[PDB]
């Protein structure tokens, strides 16, 4: 049957409520937070995934951080709520990296909560609420839609993310790194998320120019929009033929096209998706905090790795290698970007064993010149052999 909410399609503007925004955060605060907000004295990381904050008046609030898949069901949300109601008086929150945090005001409840969380697993096997993500570790991965929902991807998001966190799980439940290692993935160059400011960034990219649907382009597309959408000016207006007649369309110079797909974003008659052509570019060295060194962009170190569902072994292996070498060679407090700035790029490649390609050398506009080396300072590596 049609179960109505009360909305009247015949009189859509009748009883319409608008511009109310979200509920105020204050309505959902745990009592200990609401009371001591702004009066915190200090904090302490007790274990991987467990925090304690102490207010000026002595009150304490313990936080248990749990990893989550971001893409989740209502059933899973209801389970977090079940746990929240059982140990936290119905309270909980989500972090800026999509982990879940449960808070309690006393040690004994904390122990009970923690003991309970460790017993929750899926049939298949996987942990439902793995405790961790604090301190010098790898806490989840900021990611996108991929093949789950978007039309412009060059790769998947949930799949790769699951494969990478599985291989780095030991890094999530421990605090053994020189500093936090932020990982992020974006399924296309629009780069939603934080790929451009993370220690390791994964971005989906294409290697083939878009296909042109001349018969419908001028019907479905605002040509000036497709032309202006090209960073390298590879799109130009042209006359084409359809059924022998004259029609307005666009022409793409494959020599100026770097397959970003922005023209497709603006025009549905310029698809470029491709199973063998699409893959992932790997970046490293970015950060957003201002701790010691200023924030920085992540840099492309591996121009392309093929898509290999469901576990992307080649890509996963590259990420692991970088983390291992970095963790073994960097000094305390050094972010991947810090480390590389200290040892030098040639040394980075030498130590990681990653092959360097001219594809990593910037060639986009005048700023490109700055990425080149205007100094005699360089170290001899096997690359010079």
């Amino acid at each position: 049957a049609f179960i109505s909410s009360g909305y009247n399609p015949a009189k859509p503007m009748e009883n319409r409520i608008t511009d109310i925004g979200p509920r105020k955060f204050t309505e959902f605060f745990p009592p200990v937070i609401a009371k001591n907000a702004g009066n915190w004295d200090y904090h302490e990381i007790l274990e991987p995934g467990i925090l304690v904050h102490v207010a000026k008046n002595g009150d304490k609030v313990f936080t248990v951080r749990c990893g989550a898949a971001r893409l989740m069901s209502t059933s899973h949300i209801r389970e977090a709520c079940e746990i929240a109601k059982k140990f936290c008086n119905g309270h909980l929150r989500f972090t800026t990296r999509n982990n879940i945090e449960f808070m309690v005001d006393n040690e004994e409840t904390l122990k009970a909560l923690v003991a309970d969380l460790k017993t929750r697993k899926f049939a298949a096997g996987s942990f439902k609420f793995p405790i961790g993500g604090t301190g010098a570790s790898i806490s989840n991965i900021v990611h996108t839609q991929g093949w789950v929902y978007c039309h412009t991807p060059a790769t998947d998001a949930s799949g790769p993310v699951k494969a990478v966190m599985d291989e780095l799980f030991e890094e999530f439940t421990s605090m053994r790194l020189p500093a936090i290692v932020r990982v992020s993935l974006a399924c296309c160059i629009n780069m939603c998320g934080a790929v451009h400011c993370s220690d390791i960034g994964l971005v989906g990219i294409h290697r083939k120019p878009p296909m042109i649907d001349h018969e419908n382009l001028a019907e479905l597309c605002e040509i000036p929009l497709a032309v202006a959408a090209c960073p390298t000016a590879a799109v130009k207006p042209i006359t084409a033929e359809v059924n022998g007649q004259k029609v307005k369309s666009v022409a793409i110079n494959n020599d100026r096209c770097m397959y970003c797909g922005n023209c497709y974003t603006m025009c549905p008659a310029l698809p470029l998706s491709d199973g063998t052509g699409d893959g992932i570019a790997i970046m490293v060295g970015g950060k957003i905090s201002n701790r010691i060194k200023v924030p920085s962009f992540s840099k492309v170190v591996v121009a392309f790795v093929p898509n290999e569902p469901p576990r992307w072994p080649t890509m996963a292996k590259i990420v692991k290698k970088i983390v291992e070498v970095y963790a073994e060679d960097a000094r305390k407090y050094e972010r991947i970007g810090d480390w590389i700035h200290r040892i030098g790029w040639e040394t980075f490649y030498e130590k990681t064993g990653l092959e360097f390609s001219h594809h990593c050398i910037d060639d986009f506009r005048d700023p490109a010149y700055y990425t080149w080396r205007q100094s005699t300072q360089f170290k001899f590596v096997s690359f010079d052999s």
Binding site: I33, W40, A69, S126, K162, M175, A229, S273
Partner: protein, 435 residues
């Protein structure tokens, strides 16, 4: 359909499997324990798995280009999507995403979340994204007829509105701020909440050249990454001195208090060394450690947070607090990635936040008129120049505005600041210089 060999592989491993999670919801909808009368196919999630499995085999997405759906009165908030195989996967022929406005810093009660889940189970796929990267609660997948129904129940029963999408103001978000952090320089959540309400019109009805984002960080650590992922970033700081408790300093040197609150306990780095881990790493070298006493030459402190981050029980933020405004951050398309560029070094950060709002509104007044079609603020700045941004916000140029002054001599001047102006007569010039 149901046969999903590739996806099944992703049910193995320790990390919570989205596949195992989606399969549980499929089983739940098939069982329908609560006798719900699902308003979209009960098998919606089942077909999601089936089409995802297909994409895994072909290595290609199966969602048609874009889509334009929504609710009356608003110009955004819902990201429509139609699968490109309707016949093979009727369950996701329509698979719209609804962006729901979330409470600042995402604090929730079970009662609230369950109420949301009740509405979505009945009118949606039962799948979600617990928080899209901008902050919104994401309801993943529904059919067009349910959009108005869901909006009605959300507003009337849950007092909850839609989030933002399109060429307007997107959903703002903040770090947890003063709610549970001792480094917070201002109430990030309240500022986020007030401005979100203040600019509801600009968020629901696209009136901008393009998308615009607000993000609020309590301090330079950037837990919500504002100066990377927002056009207008507010990052708290202080203007006075770092507070130092020598007694606490001694506890760190003695080993009773662990560096960085125990963030590095998983490896044996050795006993704390204040000289090598704090004094020696300070970017400005404005710290001193002598005769057991720690000091900081605050005048030369850039407040990068490192020392405070490392000895949080001994070093505290100052009392004279405010925030900095950095603008123009964006992802690459079209002209290249951009992080926030410092605009207002220090400004008041207390409700009703009139000072901050004034900068916001002055920027919009200018950008809404001068910005080219779908040109982000960051790109308008590059095209038109930082100088112009300073003029429209009534801001005096200061050294703090640059990481480096220019090294090209292509200096523009205002005619009015050049004696004699620009109107010159070639014949007069020809009197002193023969052709």
């Amino acid at each position: 359909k149901h046969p999903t060999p590739m996806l099944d592989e992703l049910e193995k491993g320790p990390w919570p499997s989205f596949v195992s999670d989606i399969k549980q919801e499929c089983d739940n909808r098939a069982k329908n324990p609560k006798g719900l009368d699902y308003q979209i196919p009960a098998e919606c999630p089942d077909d999601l798995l089936g089409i995802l499995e297909l994409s895994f085999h072909e290595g290609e997405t199966h969602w048609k280009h874009g889509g334009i759906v929504g609710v009356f009165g608003y110009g955004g908030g819902v990201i429509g999507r139609y699968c490109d195989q309707p016949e093979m996967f009727p369950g996701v022929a329509h698979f719209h995403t609804v962006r729901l406005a979330q409470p600042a810093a995402k604090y929730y009660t079970a009662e609230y979340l369950e109420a949301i889940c009740d509405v979505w189970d009945l009118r949606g796929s039962g799948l979600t994204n617990m928080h899209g990267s901008t902050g919104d609660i994401v309801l993943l997948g529904t059919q067009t007829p349910q959009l108005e129904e869901i909006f009605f129940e959300m507003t009337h029963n849950l007092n909850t509105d839609l989030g933002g999408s399109g060429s307007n103001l997107r959903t703002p978000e903040s770090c947890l701020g003063i709610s549970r952090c001792e480094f917070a320089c201002y109430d990030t959540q309240l500022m986020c909440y007030q401005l979100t309400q203040d600019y509801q019109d600009e968020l629901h009805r696209p009136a901008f050249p393009y998308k615009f984002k607000f993000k609020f960080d309590g301090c330079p650590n950037g837990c919500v990454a504002s100066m990377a992922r927002s056009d207008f970033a507010v990052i708290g700081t202080w203007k006075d001195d770092i507070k130092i408790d020598q007694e606490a300093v001694k506890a760190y040197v003695g080993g009773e208090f662990k560096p960085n609150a125990g963030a590095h306990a998983g490896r044996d780095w050795g006993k704390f060394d204040i000289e090598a881990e704090v004094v020696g790493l300070c970017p400005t070298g404005c710290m001193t450690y002598e005769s057991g006493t720690l000091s900081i030459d605050n005048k030369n402190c850039t407040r990068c947070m490192h020392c405070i981050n490392t000895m949080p029980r001994a070093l505290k933020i100052g009392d004279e607090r405010g925030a900095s405004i950095l603008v123009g951050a964006k992802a690459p398309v079209l002209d290249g990635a951009q992080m926030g560029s410092l605009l207002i070094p220090f400004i008041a950060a207390e409700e009703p936040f009139d000072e901050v709002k004034e900068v916001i509104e002055n920027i919009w007044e200018w950008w809404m008129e001068e910005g080219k079609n779908r040109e982000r603020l960051g790109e308008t700045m590059k095209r038109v120049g930082f100088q112009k941004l300073l003029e429209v916000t009534g801001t005096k140029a200061v050294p703090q505005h640059v990481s480096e002054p220019r090294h090209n001599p292509y200096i523009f001047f205002k005619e009015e600041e050049v004696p004699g102006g620009w109107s010159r007569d070639i014949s007069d010039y020809r009197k002193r210089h023969m052709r």
